[PDB]
Design an enzyme around this catalytic site. Structure first.
Site, PDB file in Angstrom:
ATOM      1  N   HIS A  41       0.820  -1.207   0.000  1.00 18.69           N
ATOM      2  CA  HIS A  41       0.000   0.000   0.000  1.00 18.69           C
ATOM      3  C   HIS A  41       0.856   1.260   0.000  1.00 18.69           C
ATOM      4  CE1 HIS A  41       0.625   1.285   4.186  1.00 18.69           C
ATOM      5  NE2 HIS A  41       0.350   0.060   4.602  1.00 18.69           N
ATOM      6  N   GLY A 135       3.415   6.049  10.361  1.00 22.04           N
ATOM      7  CA  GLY A 135       4.749   5.840   9.843  1.00 22.04           C
ATOM      8  C   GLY A 135       5.391   4.525  10.232  1.00 22.04           C
ATOM      9  N   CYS A 137       4.244   1.488   9.428  1.00 23.63           N
ATOM     10  CA  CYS A 137       3.995   0.422   8.461  1.00 23.63           C
ATOM     11  C   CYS A 137       5.315  -0.099   7.899  1.00 23.63           C
ATOM     12  CB  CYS A 137       3.091   0.932   7.341  1.00 23.63           C
ATOM     13  SG  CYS A 137       1.518   1.588   8.012  1.00 23.63           S
TER      14      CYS A 137
END
Ligand SMILES: *[C@H](O)[C@H](CC(C)C)NC(=O)[C@H](CC(C)C)NC(=O)[C@H](CC(C)C)NC(=O)OCc1ccccc1
Ligand SMILES: [Cl-]
Ligand code: NA
Ligand code: NA
EC number: 3.4.19.12
Lengths: 297, 300
Positions: A41, A135, A137
């Site tokens: 993503h 942040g 991920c």
């Protein structure tokens, strides 16, 4: 003596963390050999949306050095970026998929920089109760074995109840989740019975003995109680795995199950176990052996 | 979201751990530049661990009586000196993995990460706090001496603890990296006990603010209290006194949540009188006191 929620030393993993930026999205990637792995993503129809992108769209920074992307492909929900330089800090590693009830360490990172480490369990409902801010991920979960890092988890999203969901390093989600902005909720969770028992053994080894009683039970009788309190079933395999702690302490598993049965039906009558007023279920039997015997890496 | 005892990533410290042996005693050392720091009881001979004269023992040692191993490499000791309860071994090679570092002596209530090690190798990492009675509640087996505690706020490693001993209640005692013990303890096996421990009130308050920031409200109440009335209650539960410094320190969390500090103190008073009635706060059925106001801001 003593017993703490202990994570694996994170140094082998710290040397693999990089920052990946696509457009205005920035998150963490895992640089192993000449490939960088990260959540797909970051490019936000991923299939249709990945073909538009080109190699120089992806900015990969290892500390203060830029890597050059020479190729890219998708595997399930993970993006793989081929780079022109192999990571000289690549450890001995492999990708594994874990089961609910198993534990691992999480290295929580921001802008490609590691910031904290903690030990978690994969819950029966396939979430983890982590601590993640914007942040994070691409932060990763792992275990260490002799000198091998087993990567098992990559963070993708936070759910409304405040728990977290992710994938294995091959991009397959843990649990019934999807990676997109749609309505999703953590299912009803349950308690990891075999882990509670392991932690009661840890308590005994550390001298906390008040919950022990003279009684024993049968797997059948105890599982009817477990079901009643939303505890996971206890299998004969679970009994066998606890065998080393039974032999070391003198308390057979079904003897300890009688203790746990009473703790469920009657509570802790105002007392604590290993400094906790709840039943702890994020230590596996192996975790208890490792910590109480001093295994190193 | 979420709230977890997070430890600092340990890699910068892993690269400094070594094994130190003298005679039949092996423990861990900390290799920074061309000096290895370790507990001075590595020289203690098996016979006298009750009243050792460390100054007398050290002068009788040769450099080659100290075996220092980094991984598969033996480091050559070229001098030695004692600083309080820490032994400093000068070696002939500077550690190429030495991070930016400083030594800091911490105050009770402060938190830090521990890298527990055996035979120079890391076993795991966890968070601790310096208790008001100057012990820590660690997890340490035989051979763990010389494991260190540290913080890594903004790329500089601050070393604050080195492990030396376990006391009868199963808690742990050690020194700063200048070799001064935390608390009244001594590195001899003479009879010693920790004082009654107390709860770190300012840290409980920080954690209740963290709970409110994470969406928990059930324990709030409409009352406010004076600092003096609050401390008279806290005393009766073996809670540490709350000072005006602590009130100042909680200012930013008070601003972020809109709940005045003495308003939150009144919530804590009520919790001490009722318990939690089968409810939890941030996943705990006890009041947690090993998160500082700084830790809460770091994580939230
Ligand atoms: C170093 O690896 C080791 C770590 C422990 C966690 C096992 N420390 C020691 O062995 C240490 C050496 C002395 C010279 C500082 N001894 C102790 O920690 C000792 C407990 C050991 C024997 C398990 N504690 C101790 O002697 O406390 C004083 C004392 C003596 C008698 C009665 C009460 C208290
Ligand atoms: Cl401090
Ligand atoms: Na029993
Ligand atoms: Na109030």
């Amino acid at each position: 003596s003593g017993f703490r929620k202990m994570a694996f030393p994170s140094g082998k993993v710290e040397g693999c963390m990089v920052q990946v930026t696509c457009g205005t999205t920035t998150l963490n990637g895992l640089w192993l050999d000449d490939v960088v792995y990260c959540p797909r993503h970051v490019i936000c129809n991923y299939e249709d949306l990945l073909i538009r992108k080109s190699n120089h769209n992806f900015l990969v920074q290892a500390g203060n050095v830029q890597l050059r992307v020479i190729g890219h492909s998708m595997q399930n929900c993970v993006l793989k970026l081929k780079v022109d330089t192999a990571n000289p800090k690549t450890p001995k590693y492999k990708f594994v998929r874990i089961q609910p009830g198993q534990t691992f360490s999480v290295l929580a990172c921001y802008n490609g920089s590691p910031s904290g480490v903690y030990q978690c369990a994969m819950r029966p409902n396939f979430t983890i109760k982590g601590s993640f801010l914007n942040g994070s991920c691409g932060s990763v979960g792992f275990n260490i074995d002799y000198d091998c890092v087993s990567f098992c988890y990559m963070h993708h999203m936070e759910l409304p109840t405040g728990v977290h969901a992710g994938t294995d390093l091959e991009g397959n989600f843990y649990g019934p989740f999807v990676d997109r902005q749609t309505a999703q909720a953590a299912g009803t969770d349950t308690t990891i019975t075999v882990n509670v028992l392991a932690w009661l053994y840890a308590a005994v080894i550390n001298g906390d003995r008040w919950f022990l009683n003279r009684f024993t039970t049968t797997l059948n009788d105890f599982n009817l109680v477990a079901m009643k309190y939303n505890y996971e079933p206890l299998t004969q395999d679970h009994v066998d795995i606890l065998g080393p702690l039974s032999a070391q302490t003198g308390i057979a598993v079904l003897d300890m199950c009688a203790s746990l049965k009473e703790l469920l039906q009657n509570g802790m009558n105002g007392r604590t176990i290993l400094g906790s007023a709840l039943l702890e279920d994020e230590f596996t039997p192996f975790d208890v052996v490792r910590q109480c015997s001093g295994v190193t890496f």
